[PDB]
A paper describes a structure:
Human sirtuin 2 ([name]) is an NAD+ dependant enzyme that has been linked to the pathogenesis of various diseases, making it a promising target for pharmaceutical intervention. Sirtuins, belonging to class III histone deacetylases, constitute a family of highly conservative NAD+-dependant proteins that are involved in the regulation of various biological processes such as metabolism, aging, inflammation and oxidative stress. Although sirtuins were initially recognised solely for their deacetylation activity, recent studies unveiled a broader catalytic scope that includes desuccinylation, demalonylation, demyristoylation and ADP-ribosylation. To this end, we expressed human [name] 56-356 as a N-terminal His6-SUMO fusion in Escherichia coli and purified the protein via affinity and size exclusion chromatography with tag removal in between.
The most potent and subtype selective [name] inhibitor 29 (RW-78) exhibits an IC50 of 26 nM, which outperforms its lead structure 24a (IC50 = 79 nM) by a factor of 3. Additionally, the chlorine or iodine atom engages in halogen–π-interactions with F235. The spacing between the chlorine atom of 29 and the centroid of the π-system of F235 (3.6 Å) matches the average distance of C–Cl⋯π-bonds (3.854 Å),50 explaining the high potency of 29. Contrary to our design, 29 and 31 do not engage in interactions with the [name] co-factor NAD+ but stabilize the enzyme in an inactive state. In addition, by interacting with the inhibitor, F96 and R97 move into the NAD+-binding pocket, displacing the co-factor and prohibiting NAD+-binding. Therefore, the determined structures do not show electron densities for the co-factor, although 5 mM NAD+ was included in the crystallization screens. Notably, the NAD+ displacement is supported by thermal shift assays, which revealed that 29 increases the melting temperature of [name] independently of NAD+. Compound 29 showed high target engagement with an EC50 value of 15 nM, validating our data obtained from in vitro inhibition studies.
Numbering used by the authors: 55 to 103, 107 to 302, 304 to 356
């Protein structure tokens, strides 16, 4: 397959991004792009997750059937985990620069914290693969009244189980609970976007949650894939790889031709890439302006 990168380094990726061959970038992002914003990863053991509620199994608090009959536990956790402020990271604003420079095809996020929207990505730019707290809906099939985060926040902090003003049904945040399908939008956008992608930028995800992780296998064979992450991720598991074989990351073998791993904090990796691209002053000015604005509204 074609080698579009002149070397398997951040420097090689930057030169490719500055070439006429790189027009359409897809970002895949996870909890690792929001930890520097003080949003802990609810999957991280060190900020791991309630015994009084008698959960049949730990993951029942995020299962749709359990939630609809016993929603109190989930809403108690929602108050406990509610961020003190919503200040997007250097990584979020790097994706805003991709948008500004006409390079952003799509940002696929596993995060529910709304920081991509606050950083200035529009709904059209975004696939919230695991849903979002940004909007909530009445669960009654005939109603489905939509409620904004401002409304849901008041209910969470008041410790009042949120009920629909029209029909008094439960109102659920638009997150994908276990037992719910990923949004139709995820599959529809994936089918179109991965025909068009020139660069896959994977940031702040261990690529362990499916089917989101399998997106890396949907990239054309020639498409360079840059991982910015604290740990190497996306390589075929030596044990699972025996079952399902094709598309796994290859950073370090003699056959490696398009995959690059930059190991460190997402903010530092995005700053390093911005610096190579001549965007460092633009990124600094954007971040300090937006942070100042958020600080003054907080
Ligand atoms: C705007 C806002 C509001 C709030 C309250 N927090 C935040 S960020 C802090 C935080 O982590 N809050 C939080 C609080 C309660 C529960 C949860 C749990 O969130 C989830 C999201 C998606 C999912 N869905 C999936 O992974 C999923 C499903 N199927 N597949 C295949 C994957 C789950 Cl299981 C849980 C998070 N941001
Ligand atoms: Zn309703």
């Amino acid at each position: 397959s074609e080698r579009l990168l002149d070397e398997l380094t951040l420097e090689g990726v930057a030169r490719y991004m500055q070439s006429e061959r790189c027009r359409r970038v897809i970002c895949l992002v996870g909890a690792g792009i929001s930890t520097s914003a003080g949003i802990p990863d609810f999957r991280s053991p060190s900020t791991g997750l309630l015994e009084k509620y008698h959960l049949p199994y730990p993951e029942a608090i995020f299962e749709i059937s359990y939630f609809k009959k016993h929603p109190e536990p989930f809403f108690a956790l929602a108050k406990e985990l509610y961020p003190g402020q919503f200040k997007p990271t250097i990584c979020h604003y790097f994706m805003r620069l991709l948008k500004d420079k006409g390079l952003l095809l799509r940002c696929y996020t596993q995060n529910i914290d709304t920081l991509e929207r606050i950083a200035g990505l529009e709904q059209e730019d975004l696939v919230e693969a695991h849903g979002t707290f940004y909007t909530s809906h009445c669960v009654s099939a005939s109603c489905r009244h939509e409620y904004p985060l401002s409304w849901m926040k008041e209910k969470i902090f008041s410790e009042v189980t949120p009920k629909c003003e029209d029909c008094q049904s439960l109102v659920k945040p638009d997150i994908v609970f276990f037992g719910e399908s990923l949004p139709a939008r995820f599959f529809s956008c994936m089918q179109s976007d991965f025909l068009k992608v020139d660069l896959l930028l994977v940031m702040g995800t261990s690529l362990q949650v499916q089917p989101f992780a399998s997106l890396i296998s949907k990239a054309p064979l020639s498409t360079p894939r840059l991982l910015i992450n604290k740990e190497k991720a996306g390589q075929s598991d030596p044990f699972l790889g025996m079952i399902m074989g094709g598309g796994g990351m290859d950073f370090d073998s003699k056959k490696a031709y398009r995959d690059v791993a930059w190991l460190g904090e997402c903010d530092q990796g995005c700053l390093a890439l911005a610096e190579l691209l001549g965007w460092k002053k633009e990124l600094e000015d954007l971040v300090r302006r937006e942070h100042a604005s958020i600080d003054a509204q907080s």
